[PDB]
């Protein structure tokens, strides 16, 4: 009890060397599409033509 008056807990914890997510990042297939100029109209004061 006497040494305990001057004692505090330690913020020590254990974690694995490497931790991975539950779901990995799967690759996404590439699809060719043409240039579209009507994608920024819905944001801001756009103009529809």
Residues at the site binding another protein, with contacts judged by CB under 8 A = 2-3, 5-6
Q: What is the C-alpha radius of gyration for the chain, rounded to an integer number of angstroms? A: 29
Q: Which is nearer to another protein, 3 or 47 (CB)?
A: 3
Nearest CB to another protein, comparing residues 6 and 35: 6
Contact 7, 1 (CB under 8 A): no
Residue 7 or 38 with smaller CB distance to another protein = 7
Closest CA to 37 of 46, 28, 29, 45: 46
Least distance in Å: CB of 1 to another protein? Answer: 9
């Amino acid at each position: 009890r006497e040494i305990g008056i001057l004692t505090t807990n330690k913020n020590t914890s254990r974690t694995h060397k490497i931790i991975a997510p539950a779901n990995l990042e799967r690759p996404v297939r590439y699809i060719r599409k043409p240039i579209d100029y009507t994608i920024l109209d819905d944001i801001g004061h756009g103009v529809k033509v």
